[PDB]
Design a protein around this nucleic acid. Sequence first.
DNA 1: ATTTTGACGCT
DNA 2: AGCGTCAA
Length: 430
Amino acid sequence: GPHMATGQDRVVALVDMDCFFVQVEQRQNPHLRNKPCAVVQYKSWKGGGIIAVSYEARAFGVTRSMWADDAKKLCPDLLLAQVRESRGKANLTKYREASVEVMEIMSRFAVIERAAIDEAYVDLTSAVQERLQKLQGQPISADLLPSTYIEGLPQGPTVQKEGMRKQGLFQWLDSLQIDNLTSPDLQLTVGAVIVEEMRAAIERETGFQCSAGISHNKVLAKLACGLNKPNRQTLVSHGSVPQLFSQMPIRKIRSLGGKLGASVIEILGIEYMGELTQFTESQLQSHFGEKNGSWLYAMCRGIEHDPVKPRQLPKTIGCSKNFPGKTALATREQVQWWLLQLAQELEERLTKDRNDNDRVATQLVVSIRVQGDKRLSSLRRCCALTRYDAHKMSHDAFTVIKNCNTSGIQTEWSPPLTMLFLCATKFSAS
DNA sequence: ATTTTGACGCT
DNA sequence: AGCGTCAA
Ligand SMILES: Nc1ncnc2c1ncn2[C@H]1C[C@H](O)[C@@H](COP(=O)(O)OP(=O)(O)OP(=O)(O)O)O1
Ligand SMILES: [Ca+2]
Ligand SMILES: [Mg+2]
């Protein structure tokens, strides 16, 4: 009752760019705008691998991970933009730079946590308090929420999409108590007004559209964001949680899409997030561990305490390349040449990072996979990163991996290498 | 023979 | 530290 926390103490948003790499390429090439199109890496093998897909192309069934040759069978007029290749490998610089554009705009509104190249969480609690003080008891107009859905509404006693959206928003706003500055639902609504402003700023200043979720924590904001993509935002209130979770597959909640989620389903014999409420905290801890158990117990009730971390920049800078099938590296010269290519890209990125962000990486992580090994990585070894020099970094990486070569023959590398990975970590201020 | 990333937990 | 999980 009066002491049961309800996890309604914060306003958190998650902003997620729509079909991000496609929008970057469509901004650059107007011929691709409003067309079925996809972004591909490499071209020789089956037309290249698709990594991003416009919503027009998704209507034909095109998805990520599909080979372009196969996507063309579903959508013969599919347009393609290719990821840049530099030093023999795919180079994602254009997308990293576009990400910086968006992250810098979002940072004007609030502290952000960069969650991925095209996603950031926003802690809006303080901004909401300020805006509520500005509003001075004035009701919130639907005109301030032109792209907002209220999850769960309309309900109770138009057949078009926008009509339904407006009916739900009207029901929500009609029922708000706009005089109580401590009302969580009012706080979320003001949050959504701010997020409309943030999303408009992003689109105005970059050309990119995005979706967003607004709720009381990161997990619900992320779930909310996906409910009405693209180019829309969704408010998930605390009161919406029981109905929303009652038919929500466990795997849809962030962190439960893999083995742990599968084990929750198998061990407990349930399918939906809401079914978790029937277990005690101790029962959940007994199956899934102390941390996961407490997290699940609160999460299934819509409660999560994970903070929005103040971090706008990536914590690592890495460069990776696979060498599948016959392209596996089987000679010392090959291994050294590719370590150099990776190290040259890494040096360029690190030097730019040091100039932009006043920091220096101090550890180099080298990871490889050997042909035959079932594991993704066969070996992961660190060494000191003391100079931003590609030849030094590639030599040090070779030094730390050379003992993996079983071959008695100096010229040959065995088993052949199917992946190389260099990653700069452990940044210090400079 | 999706690939190229990136954060965070475990021991 | 090196390995594993989960997510863009
Ligand atoms: N598995 C992957 N491998 C490589 N790049 C990826 C992968 N998944 C996503 N990306 C890249 C390309 C995407 O445009 C970008 C953001 O990913 P993501 O948010 O999952 O999808 P998306 O932005 O393309 O579409 P959506 O509108 O559904 O968010 O990251
Ligand atoms: Ca996205
Ligand atoms: Mg994303």
